[PDB]
Design a protein around this ligand. Structure first.
Ligand SMILES: *[C@@H]1O[C@H](CO)[C@@H](O)[C@H](O)[C@H]1NC(C)=O
Ligand SMILES: *[C@@H]1O[C@H](CO)[C@@H](O)[C@H](O)[C@H]1NC(C)=O
Ligand SMILES: *[C@@H]1O[C@H](CO)[C@@H](O)[C@H](O)[C@H]1NC(C)=O
Ligand SMILES: *[C@@H]1O[C@H](CO)[C@@H](O)[C@H](O)[C@H]1NC(C)=O
Ligand SMILES: *[C@@H]1O[C@H](CO)[C@@H](O)[C@H](O)[C@H]1NC(C)=O
Lengths: 50, 233, 296, 50, 49
């Protein structure tokens, strides 16, 4: 489950960091990267607790 | 011109990284510091490259005059510094100069002087640190008398800021006007131990050796028996 | 909690007035590839009387509220001047990229300040042609935030090296301008001045028009020290500072010791006493009596 | 650790609430304060669970 | 570029170095013959007979 949680978008346009970097400009890619970071952090917090 | 000699420092060159006040706190900071146990040249006056800071420690008997010249090309094509402690005048000026060791004025002429500062008219180990960050110039100094025949002695000494200059020019080469030691600076991470009086007493690196990294991670100067986790490879 | 009773403001006494005017109405504003610098320092500022829009098309401030410039202060305020068309004013924006933003002037992504631009067609528009203005168009690589580049070289496009020949596949990087009153409004020359500054631990000598107030001791009051706000009680300190130290912190890293900007003495900061409140009740079926217990 | 968690920016311009309040308009300051509130609430939840 | 030098190759809006990475849809090509002095007439924003 923890590994499968990587591929989810968590609300971002895409779930690959390199695609976000290349497709979008640096000023806007920050929000997508932040959303991905928040999602992955929440998944890691569900883990460890379990 | 005598060939250079390479002596080994003894963990010297730590300065206060900020104007803030901390006491009895094991603080970690990341800035430009002189790496411990690093060879330093022992010149006994050619132009030296100047990359990011410099550690100029000189031994003198009765505080003779000291001179330093910075710049990029030193051919009046770019601004230059002429930091000198002279009895006639202690002039700290940034101006174009054509160039030479003490004619009282070693520069041929001065055409366009953007900045010019004059202060009040004017055994022992003298240490100086010069930095060029974000269009700022900073000078640190300390006077610790010593009585040995050896050079940089063992011990731990602190450096404090003296003058900040908003010169903001391009500097890439170094020149100077008894012996002096030269050592360059690199980005490092340091742990500082201010005491109850607010002064620095001890400091340790975070990259020299694995024991240093173990002490750095634990944020303490003493490590008890046991296996520890330090970093990732 | 204990509510504060008074507010005190402590600012250095500065008589010199900031020469903001000099950069805002001058004659020889330079070109965009060679923008000039100005280090305003050590003076009381008056953003208030210059916020008043004379003719400024834009006054967009990023990172600071435009109407709150007067009360607070910064450190080492900067200013840049260059002339650009009306259609390219948008390219001067943090993060956002453009043809001239990536070749002449690139703002840092964490920039703080305002981009003050206005119109210059009324005076700086010659009928014969303002042809003294140039702007770089070609460069081998991208620029850097707050980067200076003056040297000009013959551009080389792919093969056929030029070596200063101005031949095929060779172009002069600088391109002229056609600033004349006859052209459209969208291409008239506009004078742009961008203000950059930072907030730092080192004392901020530049400050806005504000009044000082006498010190108060041993009372829950609001305080202000060079723009630093908060709440607490001020007590005379015995911790000896250094002649170059201004603030003071602790293990939690919160400002608890300050040096007076006027009298140059050491103070203390301590938040007002507070604690939990607990009530003892013997139940609401025998009596309505209670007994409050303050926690600490 | 809980005390040290108060110094992180969490994406806001500054980690000091008073500094944001005195330096930004309410319409802009609200969206900055939101991130700080979310971060501190997350830290408090973690501490309680442990 | 490897062929013979062209009389006019100045490009507007798009740079040839960056033209390889970026690309469009449905490229249209038009060929015609004019006089030598009529080249100035063949330009955006230019009016001629
Ligand atoms: C410093 O340079 C000398 C030059 O040969 C070298 O022998 C010495 O090992 C260097 N210092 C260190 C710590 O490696
Ligand atoms: C300073 O001068 C050198 C040439 O000595 C040059 O390479 C460099 O780009 C200039 N600017 C800076 C910031 O070093
Ligand atoms: C702090 O300063 C006082 C006064 O000079 C001195 O007596 C004391 O020894 C100092 N503290 C330490 C740890 O040296
Ligand atoms: C103005 O500030 C200076 C600080 O250098 C202080 O000595 C002086 O007393 C102040 N003026 C008044 C009238 O208090
Ligand atoms: C209140 O509590 C007492 C305690 O037993 C009980 O005797 C009494 O009936 C209660 N009154 C009501 C109104 O519930």
């Amino acid at each position: 489950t923890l590994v499968k949680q990587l591929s989810s978008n968590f609300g971002a346009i895409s779930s690959v960091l390199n695609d976000i970097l290349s497709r979008l400009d640096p000023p806007e890619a920050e929000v997508q990267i932040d959303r991905l970071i928040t999602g992955r952090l929440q998944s890691l917090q569900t883990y460890v607790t379990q | 011109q005598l060939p250079p000699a390479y002596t080994n420092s003894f963990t010297r060159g730590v300065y206060y990284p900020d104007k803030v006040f901390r006491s009895s706190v094991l603080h970690s900071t990341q800035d430009l510091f002189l790496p411990f146990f690093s060879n330093v040249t022992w010149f006994h006056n050619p132009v030296l490259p100047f990359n990011d800071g410099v550690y100029f420690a000189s031994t003198e008997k009765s505080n003779i005059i000291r001179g330093w010249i910075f710049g990029t090309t030193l051919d009046s094509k770019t601004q230059s510094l002429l930091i000198v402690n002279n009895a006639t005048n202690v002039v700290i000026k940034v101006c174009e100069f054509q160039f030479p060791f003490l004619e009282f004025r070693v520069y041929s002429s001065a055409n366009n002087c953007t900045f010019e500062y004059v202060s009040q008219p004017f055994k022992n180990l003298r240490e100086f640190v010069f930095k060029n960050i974000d269009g700022y110039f900073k000078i640190y100094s300390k006077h610790t008398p010593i009585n040995l025949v050896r050079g940089l002695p063992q011990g731990f000494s602190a450096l404090e800021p003296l003058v900040d200059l908003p010169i903001g020019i391009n500097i890439t080469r170094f020149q100077t006007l008894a012996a002096y030691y030269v050592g360059y600076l690199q980005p490092r991470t340091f742990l500082l131990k201010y005491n109850e009086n607010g002064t620095i007493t001890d400091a340790v690196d975070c990259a020299l050796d694995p024991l240093s990294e173990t002490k750095c991670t634990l944020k303490s100067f003493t490590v008890e028996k046991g296996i520890y986790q330090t970093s990732n490879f | 909690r204990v509510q504060p009773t008074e507010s005190i403001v402590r600012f250095p006494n500065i008589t010199n007035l900031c020469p903001f005017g000099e950069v805002f109405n001058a004659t020889r504003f330079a070109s965009v590839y060679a923008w000039n610098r100005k280090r305003i320092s050590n003076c009381v500022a008056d953003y208030s009387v210059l916020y008043n829009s004379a003719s400024f098309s834009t006054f967009k401030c990023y990172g600071v509220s435009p109407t709150k410039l007067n009360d607070l202060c910064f450190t080492n305020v900067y200013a840049d001047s260059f002339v650009i068309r009306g259609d390219e004013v948008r390219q001067i924006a943090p993060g956002q990229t453009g043809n001239i933003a990536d070749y002449n002037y690139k703002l840092p992504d964490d920039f703080t300040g305002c981009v003050i631009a206005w119109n210059s067609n009324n005076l700086d528009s010659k009928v014969g042609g303002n042809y003294n203005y140039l702007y770089r168009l070609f460069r081998k690589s991208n620029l850097k935030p707050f980067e200076r580049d003056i040297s000009t070289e013959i551009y080389q496009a792919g093969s056929t090296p030029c070596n200063g020949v101005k031949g095929f596949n060779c172009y002069f990087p600088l391109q002229s301008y056609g600033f004349q009153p006859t052209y459209g409004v969208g291409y008239q020359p506009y004078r742009v001045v961008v203000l950059s500054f930072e907030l730092l631990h080192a004392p901020a000598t530049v400050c806005g028009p504000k009044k000082s107030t006498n010190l108060v001791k041993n009372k829950c009051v609001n305080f202000n020290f060079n723009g630093l706000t908060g709440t607490g009680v001020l007590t005379e300190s015995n911790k000896k500072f250094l002649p170059f130290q201004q603030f003071g912190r602790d293990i939690a890293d919160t400002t608890d010791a300050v040096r007076d900007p006027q009298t140059l003495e050491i103070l203390d900061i301590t938040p007002c006493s507070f604690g939990g409140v607990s009530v003892i009740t013997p139940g609401t079926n025998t009596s309505n009596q209670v007994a409050v217990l303050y926690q600490g």
